[PDB]
From a paper:
The protein N is a multifunctional protein that packs the genomic RNA and enhances the efficiency of virus transcription and assembly. N contains an N-terminal domain, involved in RNA binding, and a C-terminal (NCTD) involved in RNA binding, protein dimerization, and interaction with the viral membrane protein (M). The SARS-CoV-2 NCTD folds into a helical core with a protruding β-hairpin employed for protein dimerization. Here we report the crystal structure of the C-terminal domain (NCTD) in open and closed conformations and in complex with guanine triphosphate, GTP.
The structure of the binary complex NCTD-GTP was solved in two different space groups, P21 and P1, to a resolution of 1.8 and 2 Å, respectively. Both crystal forms contain two protein dimers in the asymmetric unit. However, in the space group P21 there is one molecule of GTP bound to one of the dimers, whereas in the P1 the asymmetric unit contains two molecules of GTP, each bound to one dimer. The electron density map is well defined for the three GTP molecules, which present temperature factors that increase from the guanine moiety to the phosphates, suggesting that the guanine is well anchored to the protein and the phosphates are more flexible. In the two crystal forms the GTP binds to a cleft between the two subunits of the dimer, and adjacent to the β-hairpin in the closed conformation. One side of the guanine ring establishes a π–π T-shaped interaction (edge-to-face) with the indole ring of W330 and hydrophobic interactions with K338. The other side of the guanine ring stacks over the guanidinium group of R259, which makes hydrogen bonds with the OH– groups of the ribose ring. At the bottom of the cleft the guanine moiety interacts with the M317 and with the main chain of the residues K338 and A336. These interactions suggest high specificity for guanine, as other nitrogen bases have not as many favorable interactions as the guanine. Importantly, the C-terminal tail of the symmetry-related dimer also contributes to the GTP binding, covering the cleft as a lid, with Van der Waals and hydrophobic interactions between T362´ and the ribose and with the π–π stacking between P364´ and W330.
Author numbering:
A (entry chain B): 242 to 364
B (entry chain A): 254 to 364
The structure:
Amino acid sequence: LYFQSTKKSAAEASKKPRQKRTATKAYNVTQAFGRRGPEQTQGNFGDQELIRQGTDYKHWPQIAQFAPSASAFFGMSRIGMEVTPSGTWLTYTGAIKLDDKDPNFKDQVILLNKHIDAYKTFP
Amino acid sequence: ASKKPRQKRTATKAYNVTQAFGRRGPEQTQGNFGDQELIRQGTDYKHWPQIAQFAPSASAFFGMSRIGMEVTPSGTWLTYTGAIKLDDKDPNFKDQVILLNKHIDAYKTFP
């Protein structure tokens, strides 16, 4: 059920297009999506545990409930296309509303805030 | 179909893009993507798979994006922004550019 990263398995995982990668303990968030940080187009989400575990994180389902389906991604978002010296890029922005009538709402807010910009508190 | 929270809905002919995700338009909380055909068909659209190849996995959505939380008078919102690179070595790259051009801000020309 759980694997360790090897250069071998990392080289296979990395063949997927970025947007279709799945981070796991064997191919962690940093490996799949780059170091967390403040820059534009750099990811900022994940504390040390989530970074190391990806979708093996024990509370992953409570984060994943907020990730959009392909239909909703293209349906909800503002989509743009930019051509630059690095290539052609599909840009996306949007927002997903949390349901504040869910009795779990306060816990959802706390879990999301725990990972947003967590990288600032560790190397 | 509409029982699902917004972000988990799947548009089809039976429950189309406007029904699931609202009218296309310019404001920040609206979507801007899809011509009249995609809007009416959703994931039944004939070229849906060629669009869907750019949508992120759940892991990639939380891994690539800049994620925020904003409390506004309407509610608490999980904000997201990012960019996905097209593979310009893919022999289908030209067609992908054409396909995306057809749907981005297509609403601007609707009667």
